[PDB]
């Protein structure tokens, strides 16, 4: 269903997600990873299913180039693929709204960050689930709101390109 031009664009967006995942913006008090920009790009432009594919392949590509810091595990790929799935479910082919940004960021944070990842961390490293959750609850309480504010301005930037000449389809 997806044309070759759209497949190459998906590859470019995956490369963007990997590059931004290696980025960390802010001062020393807080370092929010810029992977959410790639997740929003994959979900908003390609949909939930190609978003899932792009998220899994971006996890594989990040493992290939920059190395999998946490050990090669399938669950991390599943989480990094379910991120763009929810982003696409809430944001694909829909008008830009603050409501959808709010819901998509909150649902991805609940399910992927303090959800599945806490399950995979507790399974791999053997700690009790509440211990891993308390380990990972701090940054994922103040980080999602910064993601919220940044995502509101990403979609404004991406829309002005899609409604422009450069984006054909």
């Amino acid at each position: 269903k997806l044309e070759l031009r759209e497949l190459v664009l998906l590859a470019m967006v995956i490369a963007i997600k990997v590059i931004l995942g290696q980025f960390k913006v802010g001062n020393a008090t807080l370092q929010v990873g810029l992977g959410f920009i790639g997740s929003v790009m994959l979900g908003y432009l390609f949909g939930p299913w190609w978003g899932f594919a792009g998220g899994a392949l971006s996890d594989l590509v990040s493992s290939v180039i920059f190395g999998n810091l946490g050990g090669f595990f399938i669950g991390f790929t599943l989480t990094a693929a379910l991120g763009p799935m929810i982003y696409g479910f809430f944001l694909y082919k829909q008008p830009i709204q603050i409501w959808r940004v709010i819901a998509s960021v909150i649902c991805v944070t609940v399910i992927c960050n303090i959800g599945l990842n806490t399950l995979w961390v507790s399974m791999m490293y053997g700690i009790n689930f509440m211990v891993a959750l308390s380990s990972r609850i701090l940054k994922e309480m103040i980080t999602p709101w910064i993601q919220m504010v940044a995502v509101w301005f990403i979609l404004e930037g991406l829309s002005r390109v899609k409604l422009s000449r450069k984006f054909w389809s």
């Binding site: 930037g157 002005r160 390109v161 422009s164 000449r165 450069k166």
Partner: protein, 272 residues
């Protein structure tokens, strides 16, 4: 005068010593991998040196200088990168051109005036303003990008192949734009591989090789030594190549020709 004092950059530059007085069209030549872009980024403190002093536009850049006080420098020294149209992001042309003045201290009414004046100067049509920059063509996008970096009237404009990928007519238009910008009293630094522009427009020719300055002279004295030019790694202007062919054909030419009009005039003088 832009002055570099034993400037070096590691992780490449090595002991560069020169002084470009303000108001001249300095041209920067050399093959890729000779640290030309490193010098270009050093000009406005994008890459601070590891050891040395840069006295550019009245501000001193030492290795230990911080990021505070650089925004005051970047208003005077502006860098235009290769394929500058890749940086266009705003919703319209006018906002994209005035994005520079807005964060270089211009008010909303001042930035609009400067952006409109420079959009007129670069040759963009008046109906093209207030349209999305992506709607335009490659030449028009290059014009918008160039207007975005000349908008606040920088003292030292340091360019990087501003007409790469453009036709000779558009290339000539842009080159005459920058040469007219020079006549206003602003220094222009041109980082190009096309020596046919260097022999025509430049008044002072830098020459890098492997990260070390090897020649700093007027283009007449740079291209007079073909033995040195081939000894190092540089190319000759086409007009100079033709003159060298004429000498090897037994037809002697007076003086040193480097541009097409002076080459033609020398040919006319030699025959008569």
């Amino acid at each position: 005068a832009i002055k570099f004092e034993n400037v070096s950059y590691v992780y490449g530059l090595d002991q560069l010593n020169f002084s470009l007085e303000e108001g001249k069209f300095i041209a920067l030549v050399g093959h890729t991998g000779s640290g030309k872009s490193t010098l270009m980024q050093h000009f406005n403190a994008l890459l601070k040196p590891t050891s040395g002093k840069i006295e550019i536009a009245g501000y001193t850049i030492t290795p230990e200088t911080g990021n505070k006080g650089l925004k005051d420098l970047r208003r005077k020294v502006s860098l235009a990168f290769q394929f500058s149209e890749a940086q266009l992001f705003e919703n319209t042309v006018l906002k994209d051109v005035e994005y520079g003045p807005r964060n270089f201290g211009f008010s909303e009414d001042e930035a609009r005036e400067a952006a409109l004046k420079w959009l007129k100067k670069v040759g963009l049509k008046d109906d093209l303003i207030e349209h999305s920059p992506f709607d335009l063509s490659g030449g028009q996008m290059r014009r918008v990008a160039l207007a975005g970096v000349l908008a606040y009237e920088p003292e030292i404009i340091c360019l990087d192949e501003p007409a790469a990928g453009l036709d000779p007519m558009g290339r000539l238009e842009m080159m005459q734009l920058f040469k007219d910008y020079q006549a206003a009293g602003h220094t222009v630094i041109l980082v190009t591989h096309n020596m046919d522009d260097v022999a025509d427009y430049a008044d002072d020719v830098l020459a890098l090789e492997h990260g070390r300055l090897i020649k700093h002279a007027s283009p007449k004295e740079v291209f007079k030594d073909s033995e040195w030019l081939q000894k190092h790694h540089l190319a000759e202007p086409r007009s100079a190549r033709f003159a060298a062919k004429l000498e090897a054909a037994g037809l002697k030419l007076p003086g040193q020709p480097l541009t097409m009009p002076e080459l033609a005039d020398a040919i006319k003088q030699s025959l008569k």
